[PDB]
């Protein structure tokens, strides 16, 4: 099937409920490697790659469809409908948290809960808003991608991953970052970094679990509180004593149990 092939959809596990795992920018479904073994005995698990990931065909990257995050939300809904999944627990890493939120606004019937990892509705600082970046910071990041994509990946991956600069996770993310076609990485990086999901948070009706590393290059802790305060749904926050934007990959021993607690248990 076109949908399953385009997004490298993999369906594994067995159980009454279905968990769908959505990855962030610069990585792919392999980011879930340490989580999947803890899910397969109890749940059906769906893994897929975002269009534009290095593992996807650059010829299918539709610039108009992906000019807003809603294009990725429609792909996620297309995957659920293709597999006849009527309800899932959705775990969204980084940009996928907002993709999940937008998909739940279009189709709240398809989601019983959203577990967010490293989420942000806005990265740029605003009047009464700390996002973590000034426009100048992003401008330098985009110029580095234009100037030398290979050197930008090598320098960015250790900062995004956090921890020891020579870890397996740093090596894995450097590799998936550099597998992206340079012009798509720039295009997508700009669309994400320039997004603003703040206005729609009060209309969310699916319960949200907001998880993040206490030290995350792109997500100040205050963003977790901003999401909790503005999401119109029931929500819970858990700030994890970890370093890194992909903590499920880089510190699984301390992070995986937190993610499992929010997948396995519901907000009272
Ligand atoms: Cl629902
Ligand atoms: Na809330």
Swiss-Prot record:
Keywords of the record: Cytoplasm, Hydrolase, Nucleus
The keyword Hydrolase belongs to this UniProt entry's keyword annotation: yes
Reported tissue expression: In young seedlings, expressed in hypocotyls and roots. In adult plants, expressed in rosette leaves, stigma, sepals and silique peduncles and tips.
Active site location: 94, 216, 245
Highest taxon of source: Eukaryota
Compartments reported by the entry: Nucleus; Cytoplasm, Cytosol
Result, substituting residue 193 to A: Fivefold decreased affinity for karrikin
Major localization class: nucleus
InterPro entries, per database record: AB_hydrolase_1, AB_hydrolase_fold
General function of this protein: Involved in seed germination and seedling development. Essential for plant responses to karrikins, a class of butenolide compounds, structurally similar to strigolactones, released from burning vegetation that stimulate seed germination and enhance seedling photomorphogenesis. KAI2 is not required for strigolactone-mediated responses, but MAX2 is necessary for responses to karrikins and strigolactones. Lacks detectable hydrolase activity against karrikin. Karrikin binding induces a conformational change.
Family: Belongs to the AB hydrolase superfamily.
Protein name per UniProt: Probable esterase KAI2
The species this protein was found in: Arabidopsis thaliana (Mouse-ear cress)
Taxonomic lineage from the root: Eukaryota, Viridiplantae, Streptophyta, Embryophyta, Tracheophyta
């Amino acid at each position: 099937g076109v949908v399953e092939e385009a997004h490298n959809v993999k369906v594994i596990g067995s159980g009454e409920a279905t968990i769908v795992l959505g990855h962030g920018f610069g990585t792919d479904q392999s980011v879930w490697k340490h989580l999947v073994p803890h899910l397969v005995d109890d749940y059906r698990v769906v893994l897929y790659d975002n269009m534009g990931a290095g593992t996807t065909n650059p010829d299918y990257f539709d610039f108009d469809r992906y000019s807003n995050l809603e294009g990725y939300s429609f792909d996620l809904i297309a995957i659920l409908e293709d597999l006849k999944i009527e309800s899932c627990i959705f775990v969204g890493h980084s940009v996928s948290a907002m993709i999940g939120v937008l998909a739940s606004l279009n189709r709240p019937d398809l989601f019983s809960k959203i577990v967010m990892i490293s989420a942000s509705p806005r990265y740029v600082n605003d009047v009464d808003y700390q996002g973590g970046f000034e426009q100048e910071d992003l401008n330098q990041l985009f110029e580095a991608i234009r100037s030398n994509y290979k050197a930008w990946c090598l320098g960015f991956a250790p900062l995004a991953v956090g921890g020891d600069m020579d870890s397996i996770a740093v090596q894995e993310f450097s590799r998936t970052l550099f597998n992206m076609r340079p012009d798509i990485a720039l295009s997508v990086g700009q669309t994400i970094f320039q997004s603003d999901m703040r206005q729609i948070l009060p209309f969310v009706t699916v319960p949200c679990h907001i998880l993040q590393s206490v030290k995350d290059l792109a997500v100040p802790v205050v963003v977790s509180e901003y999401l909790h305060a503005n999401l119109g749904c029931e929500s819970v926050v858990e700030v994890i004593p970890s370093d890194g934007h992909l903590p499920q990959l880089s510190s699984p021993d301390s992070v995986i149990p937190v993610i499992l607690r929010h997948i396995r248990n519901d907000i009272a």
